[PDB]
UniProtKB/Swiss-Prot annotation, chains A, B:
Able to bind zinc in vitro; the binding sites are different from the calcium binding sites. The physiological relevance of zinc binding is unclear. Physiological concentrations of potassium antagonize the binding of both divalent cations, especially affecting the high-affinity calcium-binding sites. Keywords: Calcium, Cytoplasm, Glutathionylation, Metal-binding, Mitochondrion, Repeat, S-nitrosylation, Sarcoplasmic reticulum. It is found in: Cytoplasm; Sarcoplasmic reticulum; Mitochondrion. InterPro entries: EF-hand-dom_pair, EF_Hand_1_Ca_BS, EF_hand_dom, S100-A1, S100/CaBP7/8-like_CS, S100_Ca-bd_sub. This is Protein S100-A1. Dimer of either two alpha chains, or two beta chains, or one alpha and one beta chain. Also forms heterodimers with S100P. Interacts with AGER. Interacts with CAPZA1. Interacts with FKBP4. Interacts with RYR1 and RYR2. Interacts with CACYBP in a calcium-dependent manner. Interacts with PPP5C (via TPR repeats); the interaction is calcium-dependent and modulates PPP5C activity. Interacts with ATP2A2 and PLN in a Ca(2+)-dependent manner. Interacts with mitochondrial F1-ATPase subunits ATP5F1A and ATP5F1B; these interactions increase F1-ATPase activity. One of its GO terms (biological process) is negative regulation of transcription by RNA polymerase II. Residues 12-47, 49-84 form the EF-hand domain. The keyword Repeat applies. Ca(2+) 2 binds at residues 62, 64, 66, 68, 73. PROSITE patterns: EF_HAND_1, EF_HAND_2, S100_CABP. The keyword Repeat applies. GO terms for molecular function: ATPase binding; calcium ion binding; calcium-dependent protein binding; identical protein binding; protein homodimerization activity; S100 protein binding.
């Protein structure tokens, strides 16, 4: 297909949107990322099938505050929580 | 926003679409992933600003054939190539 490209542009759209606000408009911070993550995934957080997995990521930012990440990194996490809330990947039957 | 969720569903839509075809409909293979990757990112491959970075991923699958990956992994790679072709993250001015 070709929709894949549409998704990539969508992810960057949001990331670029929160890129401003507070901090330098070039990268996201661990503290700021904490909000950006849930702020958007707020819908998924509503019902987490595996909070234990998400907790690891939530506390990960708590440990590092002055730290930072990149765009790709923002794409990895979102997928981590998406799976935790989505059981369409835990199928075994 | 809330579009982020739309992107997540889009990515899974394609992945789930190619999940069938050949092999077990549960996970993607290194060999099969090679096609799925470019097959979709075929548009980006048209003009790669940094083929050196992509080559590392392309040859990565060549090394491992009987290997395998997961959904999240498919989300990490796509972001790797997206950045290589996208210079909106290499800004320095």
């Amino acid at each position: 297909g070709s929709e894949l490209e549409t998704a990539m542009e969508t992810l960057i759209n949001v990331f670029h949107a929160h890129s401003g606000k507070e901090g330098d408009k070039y990268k996201l911070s661990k503290k700021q990322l904490k909000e950006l993550l849930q702020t958007e995934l707020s819908g998924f957080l509503d019902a987490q099938k595996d909070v234990d997995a998400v907790d690891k990521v939530m506390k990960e930012l708590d440990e590092n505050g002055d730290g930072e990440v990149d765009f790709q990194e923002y794409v990895v996490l979102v997928a981590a929580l998406t799976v935790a809330c989505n059981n369409f990947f835990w199928e075994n039957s």
